Amino acid sequence: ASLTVRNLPQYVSNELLEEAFSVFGQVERAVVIVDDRGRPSGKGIVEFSGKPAARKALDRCSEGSFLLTTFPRPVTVEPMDQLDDEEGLPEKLVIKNQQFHKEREQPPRFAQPGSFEYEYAMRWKALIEMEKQQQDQVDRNIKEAREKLEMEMEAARHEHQVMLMRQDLMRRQEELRRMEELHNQEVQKRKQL
Amino acid sequence: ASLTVRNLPQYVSNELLEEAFSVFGQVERAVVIVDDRGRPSGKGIVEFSGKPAARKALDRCSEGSFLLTTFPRPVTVEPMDQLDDEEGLPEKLVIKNQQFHKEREQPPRFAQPGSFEYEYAMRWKALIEMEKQQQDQVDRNIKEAREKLEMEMEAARHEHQVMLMRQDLMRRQEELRRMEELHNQEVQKRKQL
Amino acid sequence: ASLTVRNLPQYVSNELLEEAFSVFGQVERAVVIVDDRGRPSGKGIVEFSGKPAARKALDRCSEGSFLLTTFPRPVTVEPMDQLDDEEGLPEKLVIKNQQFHKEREQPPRFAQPGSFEYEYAMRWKALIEMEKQQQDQVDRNIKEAREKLEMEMEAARHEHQVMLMRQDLMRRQEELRRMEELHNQEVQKRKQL
Amino acid sequence: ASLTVRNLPQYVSNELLEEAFSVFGQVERAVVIVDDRGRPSGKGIVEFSGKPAARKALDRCSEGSFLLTTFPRPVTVEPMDQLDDEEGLPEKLVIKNQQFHKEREQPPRFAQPGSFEYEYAMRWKALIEMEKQQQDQVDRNIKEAREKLEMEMEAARHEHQVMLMRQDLMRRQEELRRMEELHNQEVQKRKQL
Amino acid sequence: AALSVRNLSPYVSNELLEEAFSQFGPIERAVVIVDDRGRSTGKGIVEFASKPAARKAFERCSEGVFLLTTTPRPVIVEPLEQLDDEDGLPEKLAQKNPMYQKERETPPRFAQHGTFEYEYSQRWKSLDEMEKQQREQVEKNMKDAKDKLESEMEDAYHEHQANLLRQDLMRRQEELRRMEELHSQEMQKR
Amino acid sequence: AALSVRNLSPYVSNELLEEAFSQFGPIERAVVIVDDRGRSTGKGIVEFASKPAARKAFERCSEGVFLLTTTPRPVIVEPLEQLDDEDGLPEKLAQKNPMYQKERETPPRFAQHGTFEYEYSQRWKSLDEMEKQQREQVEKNMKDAKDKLESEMEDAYHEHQANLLRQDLMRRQEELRRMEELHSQEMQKRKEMQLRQEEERRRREEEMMIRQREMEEQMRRQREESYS
Amino acid sequence: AALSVRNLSPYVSNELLEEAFSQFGPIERAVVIVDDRGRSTGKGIVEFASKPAARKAFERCSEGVFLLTTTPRPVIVEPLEQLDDEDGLPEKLAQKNPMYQKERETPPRFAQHGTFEYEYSQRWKSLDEMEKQQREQVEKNMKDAKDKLESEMEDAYHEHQANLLRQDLMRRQEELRRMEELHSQEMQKRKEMQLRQEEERRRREEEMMIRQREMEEQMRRQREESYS
Amino acid sequence: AALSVRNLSPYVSNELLEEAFSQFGPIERAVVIVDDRGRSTGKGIVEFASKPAARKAFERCSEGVFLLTTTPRPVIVEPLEQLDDEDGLPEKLAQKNPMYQKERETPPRFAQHGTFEYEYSQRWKSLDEMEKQQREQVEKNMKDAKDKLESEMEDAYHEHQANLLRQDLMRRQEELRR
Amino acid sequence: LESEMEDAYHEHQANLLRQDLMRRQEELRRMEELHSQEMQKRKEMQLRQEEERRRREEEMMIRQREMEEQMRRQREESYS
Amino acid sequence: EDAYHEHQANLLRQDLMRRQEELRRMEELHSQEMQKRKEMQLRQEEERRRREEEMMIRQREMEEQMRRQREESYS
């Protein structure tokens, strides 16, 4: 019953998550993932005391925009993928089918240059490097878009403030005109009779 | 066709009267009565060219208020009293009737003190002194009233000025509101089509 | 059957009031309203024992001029307005209709300066102050007129004494003349025969 | 029978257009549009003899890619928009409707600054500047895309040459194998009998 | 040397005024002011030949009592005022005062309805009407007083005659009483 | 300890007045003067149980504006006048002054036609009638003034509300204008920065572009060298 | 000495351009470009007689604002461009470039399905289609913008009129308030003066009344002595 | 001395992964990463008893190619990033930042429709969704390239054997001609 | 004496009447002259107090002249 | 007939060998060309990235100063 929270604000703390995610249920502990140097990793893991609480948190934070700071950046929540590095898989869990032995035809050894192994694994490593450059390109694209949005925060906020105050100013003026005209109508009607 | 004007302002000229009363027609002459020292007497003489123009000036100034200058006091206009000191009383002009003989029984003379003539002349002198006292009282009353009316000048002027400004402002505000509501209903009826 | 006498003379008493007005009927009690220090207020209260006595007294002292002292100052007599300061008015006597509820919407409290209540109460207070000014002006006018007629007493009294002396002296002279002429005519007639 | 050709190469001539576009018919005239200095403008004017010929040249260059020179850039062909600059607008040609008079209430003049006309004209100037900015943006985008394609020319050409050579060698090797197999089977079946 | 002789009888004349005050000095002109119809206004003007003599006449009729007609109408005497009739106030001397120009800039008019000048002119007109009615009241009061005093010509004269006769009568009665008492005593002593 | 309270609504009762003035001190009894018909005369007297509370009430209401009802009719307080109508002026104090006995020789009378007293009593009656007219004039002048001031209950309130809302709207207009001009300069300097950014990027890309083309030309040169 | 004018109203004509641009110099020929149907394209060319007149017209219409029609249609000016139409590029001048012949060695063709020219020409055609759709998008965008900005012809007019009237009303109200308060101060000072004068009058009238009463009393004493 | 490993066929288990890197030195524990279902995620972690062995393993597999299973799929090694899942960022270091307090003046909310925060969170959500689409596209491209390489198992080997035989025949012909 | 009784009685009563009328004349004359002195010395003080009132009002009027000219001067200064 | 078969097959065979040599020479030359192009592309993109990050930090500094200016103005 654990979920991962991404896109954390710049300054967050362990207790902030558990007091922010408590409105969906009784969280057990809320950890903000941190590296060796001590800076936040930008990812956090929260586990709930029950599956329905997790479902409610997931649905509500996915459909809505769960801000947890003055900084208007909603957090993205996804199920926490249980990955274990204690078991892995020993020999006994391997089915040991015909695929097992066909896959075990040579020991763990390097490929001699000039053999078919070498020119095929070189294609494989070229594919891996192309994967890495594609992922880096996507990461840099997202970083550029995010930095562009962060700069446009103040201008959008100020324009929204201007729009809101012009709107309610117009509604105040309409209220004034309506009150004045109804008062004039009613005084004329009362003096007519 | 003479015509006398009264209550003249403290700065006047016979040329001023000529220019002002020339509106009602051609004036042969207008003269402001002046005493020995040079102070205006406050009255005037206007001798128009013809009778109908004089009548028109008379009734116009009676119904209207012919102001002469900035100092806002009109000039009362009355027909001039033709008093003649040329012929006086020629004896042949007098009737010489029985009353003339009755009233010429004794020649002019003083009144013997402690007699009938002297006491009755005391009665007449007392009556004439009473008349002079009454005239002086009326003059004093009019002087006090005119000084007070002079006092109410700036107060009345500023009150009327403020009244005019307030009425003009109310008219302009009503015009603004009437134009705004007309345009509003015009666009409301246009946009519904 | 209770009246109110006004403009009392300088020197009055309960007994002066209950003797003067005993002619119209029996006086239950007549009092001269006195301020705290001990000076007459210039007012009185006469309480008869029946309605017809009150009506007769009011009518007579309103068409006549009831002097009750050598000072020629008649007393103005008016019926008494019965003011009640014991029961006042309890709530149970008040109807408590919707008019009361409209009056009974806010506590009795001061008007906050700059609010509508403060402005309108300023208008009311200015009205009351200028009412007090008008009443004091009327009081001063009546006081100066009264002081004027109080000093003209001796002049008018002596003038009337002189006029009466001259009138009955002329009557006596006419009596002398007619008696003398009739006696001479009678004796001449008696001697002719 | 009109046609305009766009995206012309850098090194062309009107005799080239007459020669090249003579395939679609008898070119009565063809001009490479040139500025005052002498550099080509990148457009052209093609005037044929018959409307079906003009339209078939138009749709042939649309569906196809009529390539003019070794530089593998086709030329887009569009129907020429015949703009007249001789008659202008005679007075009699205008509708002379009520809208015409509505648009002639005020003579041509300058907008007085600080008025409605000046502010609205400023908004229109902003709109036209937005036109200029957006058209410049489109021009820059097309410029950079074309430039990048002009470089990728040689890489694409060498890739195509090597691909065609590879396909040719594959076909020739397959033909060798097939003919050798046929010969072997034929000699085997001949020696068996 | 001008004295405002007034209260004159309607039968006075040029020669009468001329000779009456001639006793106090020579006279160069004395005329009884008349209206258009020529009837006496009740007043007059006397212009002496010598000014100090005019003063003498002024006091002599001031404390003294001067009658011109049988009816006892005293001649009030006051010094005459001088007013220029054909030489008004010249505009050149008017222009000396600085404020005359700053007044003249507004032309003569009739005001305009609703303007402050019109309302103020209405107030001035009301004051002038009040003054006119007061003057009419005073003139009517004095006309009534003159008529009442004229009605009592003969009553006062008869009363004076009777009073002087009564004084003579009581004087004679006192003489009679004195003589009679003395005669009674004198014939007693015999 | 008393104060004279007038100008009060015909609906305020004894209890309302006693509660309202209880603020300044204790009220043993406060009563509004009532005529015979039972209608309130609009006047009342307040009997404070203590002197200082009575003095403080007047001190506060002299410059303060006290009210008793929603309709803002201020209450005006004055010191109460003490008058006796049961034990007035008797003989003993009266006849001490020598003039009083000399002033009662003539019995109370009605005057008589033709005598001086009847000739002067008329001059007094005329003055009394003049005073009566001058009092009725003020009474009507105040009846009409109060009736008029009742007419503008609605209009004054409406004008006050409209003035308040207009002032609020003007303040909002000023704030909006200041925000608009500030945000306009905000946008203008950002736009200028964006244009300088784009010019710098354009020149960088152009120099980059010519560098790549120079490589391309050299690389074609190497190709044609290799071909030969 | 030719200038290009655009954004013209659909009701403008030759003589209107001549008269409007005559103020800035002589006009030889000013023609409004028309299409096959003859309708106004919204653009026009003016050919001033003298180059200084054309240039001064250009700057004065650039920094200044020109209008020609009741609708506020500012006419934007750019210098005209010269493009030869009846005469093309001389192939003799083209043949000056050495490699023009080298480029012409291949005759113009349709390309062939499969050759490199065909594929790379398809790439050029894709780029041309993208450019055309971008131009269409800009044209439609501005069409929408023009249609919108024509829709608030009257709204901005009314707003400007209302703002002018409101400013005038505010100024007049301020002046009225200033004059009213100054006049109120004048009235207050006059009332104070009048009150002091009235108090002094009352005091010395009382003094004169006292003196007259004293004379009356002494007088009565004198008459009492005389009668005895 | 921990090295992070991926690009491994599922069948390689803990004992082969620990046996393979045994040539690099002692292997106390080399564990693969597996999801809940038991299927290998293809990522493995190897921890070394000594630092120099771990570094020289990376040095050797940086330039060389290393194979575990019959299928010639190389093994990629890179230094393993240290992440903490039990001790996050405490309040003490959180508040050392002066503006951490004023950043928390607004409680965790959900925004309100029509407010600025809701207007901007929509843009942020759109950015996140487009990022998800781009990442999914990259993963799909990788899956398709995986499939394409796996299909070319037999053709590449057959072509290589034929080529070796062809050069053998050519050199035999060249020798025979001489 | 018989014929003169009525005449003597008439003369007696007429003489008493005449002397009574004489004393009434004397008393009325004294009353009139005393009242004339009263009215005269009242009118004297009336005129004196009227003169004082007139000078008082003149003083107040010129004081108001100074106040009003100063106030108009201040208004003009504030205008500039 | 076998002699002509062998002659024709052999001649086509040396033709195929020569054209295979031309193909492999073209392949290797073009691979070198692409390698150089890609190296310049990578260097070029790195330069663009560095200039963009510097440009962004400069804009961020401007934004911070501008926020401080508005904070001062509001007070």
mmCIF file of C-alpha atoms in Angstrom, chain J:
data_model
loop_
_atom_site.group_PDB
_atom_site.id
_atom_site.type_symbol
_atom_site.label_atom_id
_atom_site.label_comp_id
_atom_site.label_asym_id
_atom_site.label_seq_id
_atom_site.Cartn_x
_atom_site.Cartn_y
_atom_site.Cartn_z
ATOM 1 C CA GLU J 1 29.986 -25.884 -73.983
ATOM 2 C CA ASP J 2 31.351 -26.020 -70.439
ATOM 3 C CA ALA J 3 34.324 -23.840 -71.395
ATOM 4 C CA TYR J 4 32.048 -20.957 -72.396
ATOM 5 C CA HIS J 5 29.941 -21.455 -69.261
ATOM 6 C CA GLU J 6 33.057 -21.229 -67.092
ATOM 7 C CA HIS J 7 34.364 -18.226 -69.046
ATOM 8 C CA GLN J 8 31.110 -16.284 -68.696
ATOM 9 C CA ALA J 9 30.594 -17.177 -65.029
ATOM 10 C CA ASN J 10 34.191 -16.224 -64.226
ATOM 11 C CA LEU J 11 34.018 -12.897 -66.065
ATOM 12 C CA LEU J 12 30.784 -11.976 -64.251
ATOM 13 C CA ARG J 13 32.542 -13.072 -61.037
ATOM 14 C CA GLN J 14 35.466 -10.669 -61.418
ATOM 15 C CA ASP J 15 32.959 -7.962 -62.342
ATOM 16 C CA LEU J 16 31.089 -8.656 -59.096
ATOM 17 C CA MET J 17 34.336 -8.651 -57.085
ATOM 18 C CA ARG J 18 35.391 -5.287 -58.515
ATOM 19 C CA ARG J 19 31.979 -3.738 -57.912
ATOM 20 C CA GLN J 20 31.948 -5.131 -54.363
ATOM 21 C CA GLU J 21 35.300 -3.434 -53.805
ATOM 22 C CA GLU J 22 33.839 -0.157 -55.079
ATOM 23 C CA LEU J 23 30.817 -0.591 -52.802
ATOM 24 C CA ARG J 24 32.906 -1.221 -49.690
ATOM 25 C CA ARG J 25 35.207 1.706 -50.476
ATOM 26 C CA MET J 26 32.165 3.970 -50.794
ATOM 27 C CA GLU J 27 30.714 2.567 -47.565
ATOM 28 C CA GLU J 28 33.849 3.200 -45.508
ATOM 29 C CA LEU J 29 34.446 6.670 -46.961
ATOM 30 C CA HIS J 30 30.849 7.671 -46.263
ATOM 31 C CA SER J 31 31.085 6.263 -42.731
ATOM 32 C CA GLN J 32 34.072 8.521 -42.086
ATOM 33 C CA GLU J 33 32.149 11.461 -43.523
ATOM 34 C CA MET J 34 29.158 10.813 -41.255
ATOM 35 C CA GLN J 35 31.472 10.434 -38.251
ATOM 36 C CA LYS J 36 32.990 13.870 -38.829
ATOM 37 C CA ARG J 37 29.548 15.409 -39.365
ATOM 38 C CA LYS J 38 28.245 13.870 -36.135
ATOM 39 C CA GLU J 39 31.271 15.049 -34.157
ATOM 40 C CA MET J 40 30.722 18.628 -35.290
ATOM 41 C CA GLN J 41 27.012 18.278 -34.536
ATOM 42 C CA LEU J 42 27.778 17.143 -30.976
ATOM 43 C CA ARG J 43 30.316 19.912 -30.321
ATOM 44 C CA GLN J 44 27.886 22.429 -31.805
ATOM 45 C CA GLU J 45 24.965 21.257 -29.673
ATOM 46 C CA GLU J 46 27.149 21.383 -26.556
ATOM 47 C CA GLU J 47 28.063 24.995 -27.307
ATOM 48 C CA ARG J 48 24.396 25.851 -27.815
ATOM 49 C CA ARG J 49 23.480 24.189 -24.506
ATOM 50 C CA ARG J 50 26.153 26.104 -22.597
ATOM 51 C CA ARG J 51 25.147 29.450 -24.064
ATOM 52 C CA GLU J 52 21.488 28.707 -23.328
ATOM 53 C CA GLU J 53 22.179 27.884 -19.675
ATOM 54 C CA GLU J 54 24.185 31.092 -19.249
ATOM 55 C CA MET J 55 21.401 33.041 -20.956
ATOM 56 C CA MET J 56 18.800 31.482 -18.660
ATOM 57 C CA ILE J 57 20.750 32.283 -15.493
ATOM 58 C CA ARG J 58 21.141 35.873 -16.682
ATOM 59 C CA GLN J 59 17.383 36.116 -17.243
ATOM 60 C CA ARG J 60 16.784 34.601 -13.796
ATOM 61 C CA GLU J 61 19.042 37.227 -12.217
ATOM 62 C CA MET J 62 17.097 39.934 -14.046
ATOM 63 C CA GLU J 63 13.828 38.438 -12.784
ATOM 64 C CA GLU J 64 15.067 38.357 -9.186
ATOM 65 C CA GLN J 65 16.231 41.975 -9.339
ATOM 66 C CA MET J 66 12.906 42.958 -10.916
ATOM 67 C CA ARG J 67 10.958 41.209 -8.148
ATOM 68 C CA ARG J 68 13.056 43.035 -5.552
ATOM 69 C CA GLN J 69 12.308 46.320 -7.334
ATOM 70 C CA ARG J 70 8.572 45.649 -7.238
ATOM 71 C CA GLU J 71 8.819 44.709 -3.563
ATOM 72 C CA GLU J 72 10.526 48.037 -2.858
ATOM 73 C CA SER J 73 7.928 49.930 -4.904
ATOM 74 C CA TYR J 74 4.985 48.304 -3.106
ATOM 75 C CA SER J 75 6.305 49.354 0.314
#
